[PDB]
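=== Structure Prediction Worksheet ===
Name of assembly: unnamed complex
Input type: mixed (protein and possibly other molecules)
Chain count: six
Listed entries:
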Amino acid sequence: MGNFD
Amino acid sequence: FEERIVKLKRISKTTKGGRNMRFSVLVVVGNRKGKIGYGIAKALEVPNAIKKAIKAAHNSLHTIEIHKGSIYHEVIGRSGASRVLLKPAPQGTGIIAGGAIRAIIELAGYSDIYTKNLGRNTPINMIHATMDGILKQLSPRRVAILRNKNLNE
Amino acid sequence: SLAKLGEMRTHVGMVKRYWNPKMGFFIEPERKHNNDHFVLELQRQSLQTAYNYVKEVAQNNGQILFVGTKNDYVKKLVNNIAKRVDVAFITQRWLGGTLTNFKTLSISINKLNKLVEKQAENAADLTKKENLMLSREIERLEKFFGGVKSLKRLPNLLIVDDPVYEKNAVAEANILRIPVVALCNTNTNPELVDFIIPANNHQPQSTCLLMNLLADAVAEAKAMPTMFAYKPDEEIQIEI
RNA sequence: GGUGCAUGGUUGUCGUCAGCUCGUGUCGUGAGAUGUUGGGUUAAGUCCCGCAACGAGCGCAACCCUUAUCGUUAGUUACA
RNA sequence: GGCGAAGGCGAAAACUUAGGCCAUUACUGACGCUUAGGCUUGAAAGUGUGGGGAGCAAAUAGGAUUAGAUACCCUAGUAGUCCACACCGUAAACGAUAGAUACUAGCUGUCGGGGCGAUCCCCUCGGUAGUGAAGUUAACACAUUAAGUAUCUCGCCUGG
RNA sequence: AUUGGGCGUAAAGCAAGCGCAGGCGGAUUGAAAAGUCUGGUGUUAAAGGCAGCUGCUUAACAGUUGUAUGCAUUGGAAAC
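=== Predicted Assembly ===
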């Protein structure tokens, strides 16, 4: 994963 | 949300001047929507133990994705010399398992299943075996995606 | 420019035979001298990826954590960046469990704020002995919780100087889902770190550059002035 | 009147000896524990150092009076 | 540490004898492994024959001792303790893990053979342990020579 | 506990070796297919059940219909 939302 | 217990255990701490009985209990929290967790708590009376076990089990809640109402493959649950065979049940035949085992199956929200017992089936051993089984399952879409096939069977 | 050989005054020299076999596969095909060496280009790209990801995370208006607890080198660097950039930090040793157990952190920091607000409000509210005891507790809080009293919620991102040497930090980070960056060493596990940054930290001449570059990243991301990470020279920082 | 190997209460005792429990989080499936361990400081779990520990509760802890220095309200049935 | 099938092998000299380690790109042309049955050896003790018994010491004698002692205690003391010829065929004969085979982290090693070479050191090939990842068991622990992964064969297991 | 279990501390490795028979067995090429799978055919009575129908008070049950292991002959298959 490279997103936080 | 069901929050079903399995069994109350009694122990005793070997100390002179009154052997301390801080006995442990174990509860399982689920919601029949894939969320599964269980917690064991050691306390002295009923309400404190119930509350601590509820906190332990509900805080340890984790979801497991649900296939069709029944499993599609046979699988072995191995824990502490206690094995349980899971076999697919067609969606119109029925669910066969033991009381606590059936409680575990329902807690995951899974419909009619086939089960079989092996080894010494002390309830904690069966709980660990069921946890292993629900975590060791493989998915058809996973093997279809990680491989090159369009059928996805 | 950014993390090239000119800035690199030291990239190898870590003491030998402290290494991980699977960390001999991601980086530096095995040297015959068996000295712990590191790759240049892969580390450069990994650092660039960490830079842009932390840029994006900061643009998402999130929380960040920075660590340093070494004898004086990493501690001095993290203190300089802490008074430079407002990030969560620990100036002293990890308490064993300080990330996984979270409610105890909340009660400790609530007591810390109570003490700070009492001291700020107090013009004449305690005796000399009582005030001395309260100041002792304040100093003890400054030692460990003082570096994190600034923010009152879980930091969404965190760096690790050495996950194996900070075993508690890496364990408590793997307990949670928070993404983590780490200056990976040859005796570490890449699966324990969300984003690999394989670089030598036991050689301080490289970890100082890494710390400065992360400071640049957080400063530029926070819309603040930036000193390095795009510059044809860097200052000498060597042990005396 | 008997009946503390039937008691309440009370006391002696180890002993003014630093030891005894709980909450959270962690090793483990458990019988358990980590704090409570190891270093220094005191009588002391008193404190901090390091440390899956952090905290909290009991003991300890100290808050009393007399004394020791001085002052203050008051002066005999002290002084004289 | 080495030789070892284990049990075991050390004051040394020679005779005879087995196997070994290291590379063989040279040879044979699968001739290989296990093992029903069978065979052999097989700690110590002990029995029979000949010796002789330094030293101690089964049995036995005297003396302590406790309430009691054909005991732990002391002094003795016989068998025996040795080998050659015969037998016995058992053990904690245990590394508490049958043999053969293949793969599998890593680190510290240690010894010997190969070369480098002045010892040192390097890796290679074998023996040899400890540490330790993963994995395994309920754990202990095993952990590259596994109690991991498995195969072939033999032998055993079935509550007391 | 082939199916459907193990042998270290529990019950389990003979004390070990030689060790026949037997079992298992390096690679490549061919044929037969002995084994094996499979096609054609026959046989494997009825009755038992599985299913449908009929007669029953639904009913057990009776009758009707088919369902099959297994063996033999013949044609192939070539992986083992």
